[PDB]
Task: inverse folding
């Protein structure tokens, strides 16, 4: 950075509160809805296909299935908002728009994975409608905002509206693939395992991907009664009643669905299923001890608030809190492995 | 190497306005303010001022406040939990000495009926002449609680804007006569004349609106249609009118103003303007956000740059445009008829 900056004298303060600047807080609702529209119009892939390209609104709508003659002027009102917010790069000539580091993740990789399914689910109408009632969690004990908004719970609602069910399933699948891609680069604890029981989790995709990379692991997928992957045996059951005997257990985004008392009971059922020397491997985002405006913080705060609206008993936790859960279930040794951006793998070791 | 893991954090964009709305509705910002200047309060201290039975209210509240602190809407100090205070932007969420804040506008732009319509904004790109609100709710916006939210949003915004106009712009002091085009029942013009009592005021509005209007000091009511003609007067006020209309209709209004003015007369225009270069700042979003709301609610209208406003005035026959920037994208513009 060029330039010499003297400490110098103290900046003179402005007088009064300028309420006109506070009107700009309306940017907070407009930006996510503008982003959602641009995702649904495929703007980011259209830009990417052009190659550090920057495209005019006319060039972008040329690739959108519309015949609306005013499409470009309409689209520019949306793109202007994304450019002002640094989601798109802008050159003012009208304006042309390109990708930024922030928006590269909206373009699917070689294997078709991006963050788009997560973003579309977390801003889905049924979820956003329930966010209007998040304050009820403060005011009334035991109220679930989604249930109050829709008169049924999230999974009952998703079973009626298949559009919400596809959207949720694709979101969890994308997030899991993204997180495990990073886990497999950093975490070394699968290396010498011979058996792993996945407790919770769903269809068995994450476990099958572990066994692909660690072919000596014999997998068991343990799940509630409702696609068999080789080397993955499927067992139906309720983890609050018991867990099948296990050399090692995998808990991938399970504990954050449950309050402390229920998370402790899951881990106690894990403890009694393990032999001496067995391990629980926990994959979770961890709340940083000091929050700030950074990816580590928002990767924990965002699922925390979505949980508050869909399932307020669940919550995100700090490393200290995770260690507290482990000790309440009788584990005496805990190991923490930072992966990236707040994602951690934790090992709870049975004596 | 694309960082997809960090990109999952873009879901924070929907979480932040909903946490902010919850905190406004829990009255969090006024509770912090009443603790005194530079106060920072724990969640337990804030919950003690909120009527609730719930023994876990403080823990639940911290889940919302944490988000606003991490996003810089609240200031944060970490004790051994966090304490929260106001920042420059959240100070605007507390009423000032004149009783008003930006809260009504924030609550309207994130209101349920508005946000539900935002889901169909892509239909404006895809299908000619679709109005997102109409497709969402099966009827017009004015045909469609919500009317309360809308009126108070527009009233708070106008009150905040004009309190600043009056401080910065000195062009009302020596006017002798003023027509307010689209003045409603004339309240706003009456309040201008209260501040500047030498102005002779004319409230000009459609007949069914003026039918309900009371008598105000210094104000004469005249009924009619601004697209056919405007009353003769020395000066004309267009406050928040032109952004409701496309270029052709705006030029027609201004051509009617030009006809109604004497040589030397002026149109005074109060609007937010789009900056030439957009940035992550209120000067950009104070025009971008109304523009998106109109796309969802009032097709036809649009926000404009200063250069575009000059273009309208010159096309309507005015000889000079004169700009008085107020703050944060708000401008007064004078369009002068040649003498």
Result:
């Amino acid at each position: 950075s060029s330039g010499l900056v003297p400490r110098g004298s103290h900046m003179a303060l402005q007088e009064g509160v300028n309420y006109l600047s506070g009107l700009g807080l309306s940017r907070l609702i407009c930006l996510p809805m503008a982003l959602r529209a641009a995702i649904e119009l495929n703007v980011f892939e259209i830009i990417f296909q052009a190659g550090e390209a920057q495209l005019s609104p006319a060039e972008i709508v040329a690739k959108i299935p519309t015949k609306n003659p005013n499409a470009a002027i309409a689209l520019d009102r949306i793109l202007r908002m994304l450019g002002a917010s640094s989601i798109l790069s802008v050159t003012t000539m009208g304006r042309v728009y390109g990708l930024t580091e922030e928006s590269r993740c909206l373009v699917a990789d070689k294997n078709g994975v991006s963050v788009v399914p997560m973003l579309l689910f977390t801003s889905d109408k049924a979820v956003v409608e329930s966010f209007y009632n998040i304050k009820d969690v403060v005011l009334e004990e035991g109220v679930i905002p989604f249930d109050r908004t829709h008169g049924m719970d999230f999974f009952a609602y998703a079973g009626k509206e298949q559009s919400v069910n596809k959207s949720f399933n694709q979101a969890m699948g994308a997030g899991s693939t993204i997180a495990f891609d990073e886990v497999f680069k950093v975490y070394k604890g699968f290396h010498d395992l011979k058996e792993l029981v996945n407790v919770g989790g769903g269809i068995g995709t994450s476990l099958s991907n572990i066994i692909f990379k660690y072919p000596h692991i014999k997998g068991i997928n343990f799940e509630l009664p409702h696609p068999n992957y080789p080397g993955v045996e499927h067992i139906a059951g309720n983890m609050f009643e018991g867990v099948p005997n296990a050399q090692n257990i995998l808990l991938k985004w399970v504990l954050h669905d449950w309050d402390d008392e229920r998370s402790i009971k899951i881990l106690q059922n894990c403890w009694k299923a393990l032999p001496e020397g067995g391990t629980v491997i926990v994959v979770e985002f961890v709340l940083p001890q000091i929050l700030g405006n950074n990816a580590e913080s928002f990767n924990a705060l965002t699922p925390d608030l979505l949980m508050m609206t869909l399932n307020p008993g669940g919550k995100e936790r700090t490393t200290t809190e995770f260690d507290g859960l482990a000790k309440a279930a009788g584990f005496a040794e805990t190991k923490f492995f930072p992966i990236s951006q707040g994602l951690h793998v934790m090992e709870f070791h049975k004596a």
